[PDB]
């Protein structure tokens, strides 16, 4: 009694919440219990799916009487793992306590024991099952079932697998609606029907953390607590959809704008936002917006991925910038996998294999699990030309069916992820000089390179070939100013003030920036040129105090001249 | 047990400052129908207990919501039952009655400090709370992150009833305010007076040199230590004035840092060091210049403060002393040397030792020696998994082992030595006239290492083949090394100028660097002397001079005693 509480008796007095739905799942649980042998139900599931609640809901049904006569008198007791284990801290002392508890249940016929999180415990579990005097309910995670139940033949034979699947979107809101009267009575304030339905959709799309149904129940209670606690509750007797989103911000860790509904609103601002931080190449961003626009409208196959993008040109063509901004604008975690490392059998196995350890089974496919970890996260691929043709074939499979299957058996859905690729074929051909007495430009069309490097089917499945325009000199000058501004703000904290001449910015721009390497060398060029000379003075010299710095160039020698003042 | 609300009126609890974000989140979860019991998990020494007490004080103040007002916070001592109720059966009488007292008052709240002890007499406390509470009784639990995993994950019942709310680290400005509030107690205890400016500097200085503890604990310790230091350490006048100079001695002893490290008067050491390291290693002036330049930049220019002060990669031909630079760098800089051999870390199973306890080292070394030079020799040998640890260490600047303690990598300087550069096209061109061959820059280094990891490295330093002139300088170093060894036996070695040139050219190999130079000197100088020392006049110690004869172009050894 003390070690294990009585759920059936508890439900008779109250506390247990009535279970709505799950009629088919509960029906099967009743069926196995009525069996002469192998009558130990196993509510396999995931955290938050309601498997524990199903046990509590089953106990309520028995007292209510919605069960066969044989099961009407049965009593479900939930074994407390913490109570028995706590206070002993010894091997075999815990078992002695379990023997006494088991004896009490064995003495009383038609007694049901519920071992929540049974995998944690799993010596005495096998004997009670083999005897068959008392049937036992066990809740274990799907991952733990394979690790423990499947490996042990005896445990698997006695326990019957009952598949507990998460309810659909419509089902999840219905569960909240069924349980909404209880909540409203508890705090005396109600939620609008639009708000509860919206909570399910907004929670899963942004938080993506515990469970589809669990997040809905947790998000509704969190919203009511904030609104009721606030003094405005007297004036505000209903919960607005935005109010939940504002409360959801606390458990989101992102601004309210991201949580705010932007299915159609993001389209207009996202186009402007890309241009706000990126100068020029409006056509390139328009191609990206057009492909994702199709998914929001919804006039497409559900399995087909959200969007397909492509990038060409030299390294550092804003692939990281546009992707980071695109991910930020869409409020999706940025996931980037580099094909540059996938050039060997061991490395190429990484997409669907577990390079960290063969013993390790949880990670499985690193690229595949990344999608599973974040359903909406964007996938950024770079230097795909390097990768072997065989690896590229698997990409074609997911693009067609919009789904993948891991070696471990996990299934990943690409219906919610946009796939973008980056290619740098142009730099290799253009830099080469023609083999002739008089040289000729070796620049070639980017589309030509995509066709030769990749198979025709890839282009056919791909919605369109997107070529990003090359960087402009005006942008490079602005980029130089940004780095100086970044360096400038860093110096202001220490108390040093740096002033750079306009001619100095142009001077660094010509030598630093390269056509083949884009803006990558300019970044490095600004660090060594400016940080190194001041660094010596900052430690010891004129810049130790005051921090007065001037930057200028000498036209006669074409070398930068640095002036240091003690100040 | 005691009533914090009544204690607030007495004034025992100091006024809460800051923590608005945590308090706002804490009060809402408390009101929730489910997970009504807040769980204030926090890092060690983060002031989790103190902020919880502050919440009780806020109730009387009325800053909290009107509904929350009148809530009666309570605090129960664990030792009151572990020690007081030695007998069996008395425990149930006290908690059943206590829980009844908590009950009959809806606003009543409890605060069980160190909740990990409560769950894991201990067992009865865990079970008794949920069975009869039925959500009527609300409680607050404080525990460490390490302890939190041991209890929260093992028992799912607590998790459904408890909402984990993290405790943020207070700002330095926030921390100094706490010291001012508690300053009268510390001053009265040691009869010392603390300067307001110096107290603020103590918080800044404490974080700069002490990182194992958190901001509140380290700030409290330095201030309290200063009172004891001023109380007894100054023999002259037993002055009560506490200046930043005095606190420097306090942090100096506590942080195991040398006197004048606080002064920062090491610019001359770094300034002269430009050629001190180059004096010991010849032919790597360009390589060392870049290395020293980066160190100078990192010390003055913080750049990314979160990342380690220095990240370097040494690649080049064999015998160029790439590893030599690392060992000498620690001596010239004066920092301790930490050496790890990745050859032992060849397999994947063994790397678990590198990060934490074995399933069923880097972090431990760093905490023990924050100021150190982590020489990850033969880095290429280890599996790519290690690169992930280095990647996390470089970007985040901290690593967590199985114990979960945080290691400070900002002070330590990470360096590695790779042997990819040894590969060279030794074979000469197929022609009457030989043609120089240049290897592709970092071709092997680029392929072997991942691009993101390589980009994080500040500079992939290279090492050029030792020049013939440079090799001559190395000969002098080995001669001096032989000379000091012979000093113990008593022999004095003199080497002719012409002898040095002959030895240098015979042992000058670009691919092998300076390694063959040791062998030629060993065969030409150490081997003859050994026979003479064991079976000659040199046994008792005598002058020896070596000079080559032009006619036969071979060294001649003369022994005297
Ligand atoms: N450039 C150098 N300057 C001074 N001594 C050197 C130099 N290169 C090698 N040595 C000597 O060689 C020994 C140390 O060599 P190491 O530092 O192990 O060389 P290394 O090139 O790192 O070796 P590998 O390539 O890893 S086998 C000591 O006796 C040094 O004095
Ligand atoms: N289908 C469902 N019907 C009713 N409540 C559900 C359902 N699924 C989940 N819940 C809710 O899940 C909450 C926690 O129970 P459960 O998810 O079984 O816990 P656990 O995650 O520990 O297995 C309960 O408060 C319950 O109301
Ligand atoms: N707002 C505050 N007012 C007063 N003291 C505070 C405040 N915040 C933190 N403290 C201090 O925090 C300390 C409590 O640390 P504690 O939580 O017991 O550490 P640990 O978790 O390592 O055992 C005390 O010195 C206390 O005075
Ligand atoms: Mg070496």
From TrEMBL, chain B:
<dbReference type="GO" id="GO:0005737">
    <property type="term" value="C:cytoplasm"/>
</dbReference>
<keyword id="KW-0645">Protease</keyword>
<dbReference type="GO" id="GO:0034605">
    <property type="term" value="P:cellular response to heat"/>
</dbReference>
<keyword id="KW-0067">ATP-binding</keyword>
<keyword id="KW-0547">Nucleotide-binding</keyword>
<protein>
    <recommendedName>
        <fullName>ATP-dependent Clp protease ATP-binding subunit ClpA</fullName>
    </recommendedName>
</protein>
<keyword id="KW-0378">Hydrolase</keyword>
<comment type="subunit">
    <text>Component of the ClpAP complex composed of six ClpA subunits assembled into a hexameric ring in the presence of ATP, and fourteen ClpP subunits arranged in two heptameric rings. Binds to ClpS.</text>
</comment>
<comment type="function">
    <text>ATP-dependent specificity component of the ClpAP protease. It directs the protease to specific substrates. It has unfoldase activity. The primary function of the ClpA-ClpP complex appears to be the degradation of unfolded or abnormal proteins.</text>
</comment>
<keyword id="KW-0143">Chaperone</keyword>
<dbReference type="GO" id="GO:0005524">
    <property type="term" value="F:ATP binding"/>
</dbReference>
<keyword id="KW-0677">Repeat</keyword>
<dbReference type="GO" id="GO:0006508">
    <property type="term" value="P:proteolysis"/>
</dbReference>
<dbReference type="GO" id="GO:0016887">
    <property type="term" value="F:ATP hydrolysis activity"/>
</dbReference>
<dbReference type="GO" id="GO:0043335">
    <property type="term" value="P:protein unfolding"/>
</dbReference>
<dbReference type="GO" id="GO:0008233">
    <property type="term" value="F:peptidase activity"/>
</dbReference>
<comment type="similarity">
    <text>Belongs to the ClpA/ClpB family.</text>
</comment>
């Amino acid at each position: 009694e003390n070690f294990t509480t009585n759920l059936n008796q508890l439900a008779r007095v109250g506390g247990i919440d009535p279970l709505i739905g799950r009629e088919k799942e509960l029906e099967r649980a009743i069926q196995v219990l009525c069996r002469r042998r192998k009558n130990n139900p196993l509510l396999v599931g995931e955290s938050g799916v309601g498997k524990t609640a199903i046990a509590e809901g089953l106990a309520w049904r028995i007292v209510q009487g919605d069960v066969p006569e044989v099961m009407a008198d049965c009593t479900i007791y939930s074994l407390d793992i913490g109570s028995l284990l706590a206070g002993t801290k010894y091997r075999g002392d815990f078992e002695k306590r379990f023997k006494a508890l088991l004896k009490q249940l064995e003495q009383d016929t038609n007694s049901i024991l519920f071992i929540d999180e049974i995998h944690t415990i799993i010596n005495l579990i096998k004997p009670l099952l083999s005897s068959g005097k008392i049937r036992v309910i066990g809740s274990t995670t799907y991952q733990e079932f394979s690790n423990i139940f499947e490996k042990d033949r005896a445990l698997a034979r006695r326990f019957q697998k009952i598949d507990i699947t998460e309810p659909s979107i419509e089902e999840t809101v219905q569960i909240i609606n069924g349980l909404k009267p209880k909540y409203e009575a508890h705090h005396d304030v109600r939620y609008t029907a639009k708000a509860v339905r919206a909570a399910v959709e907004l929670a899963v799309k942004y938080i993506n953390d515990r469970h589809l149904p669990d997040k809905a129940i947790d998000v509704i209670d969190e919203a009511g607590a904030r609104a009721r606690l606030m003094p405005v509750s007297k004036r505000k007797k209903t919960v607005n959809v935005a109010d939940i989103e504002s409360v959801v911000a606390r458990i989101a860790r992102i601004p309210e704008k991201s949580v705010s509904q932007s299915d159609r609103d993001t389209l207009k601002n996202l186009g402007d936002r890309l241009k706000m931080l990126v100068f020029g190449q409006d056509k390139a961003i328009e191609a990206l917006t057009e492909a994702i626009k199709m998914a929001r409208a919804g006039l497409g196959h559900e399995h087909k991925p959200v969007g397909s993008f492509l990038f060409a040109g030299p390294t550092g063509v804003g692939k990281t910038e546009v992707t980071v901004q695109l991910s930020k604008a869409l409020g999706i975690e940025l996931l980037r996998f580099d094909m540059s490392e996938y050039m060997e059998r061991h490395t190429v196995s990484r997409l669907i294999g577990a390079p960290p350890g063969y013993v390790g089974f949880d990670q499985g496919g690193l690229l595949t699990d990344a999608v599973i970890k974040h359903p909406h996260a964007v996938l950024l691929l770079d230097e795909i030309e390097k990768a072997h043709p065989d690896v590229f074939n698997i990409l074609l499979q997911v693009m067609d069916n919009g789904t993948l299957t891991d070696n471990n058996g996990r299934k990943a859905d690409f219906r919610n992820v946009v796939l973008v690729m980056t290619t740098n074929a142009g730099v290799r051909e253009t830099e080469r000089k023609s083999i002739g007495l008089i040289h000729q430009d070796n620049s070639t069309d980017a589309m030509e390179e995509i066709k030769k490097i990749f198979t025709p089917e890839f282009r056919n499945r791909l919605d369109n070939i997107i070529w990003f325009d090359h960087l402009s000199t005006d942008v490079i000058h602005q980029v130089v100013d940004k780095f100086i501004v970044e360096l400038q703000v860093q110096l202001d904290q220490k108390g040093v003030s740096l002033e750079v001449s306009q001619e100095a910015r142009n001077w660094l721009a010509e030598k630093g920036y390269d056509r083949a390497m884009g803006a990558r060398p300019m970044a490095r060029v600004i660090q060594d040129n400016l940080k190194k000379p001041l660094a010596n003075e900052l430690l010891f010299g004129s810049l130790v105090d005051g921090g007065q710095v001037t930057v200028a160039l000498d036209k006669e020698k074409n070398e930068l001249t640095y002036g240091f003042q003690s100040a």
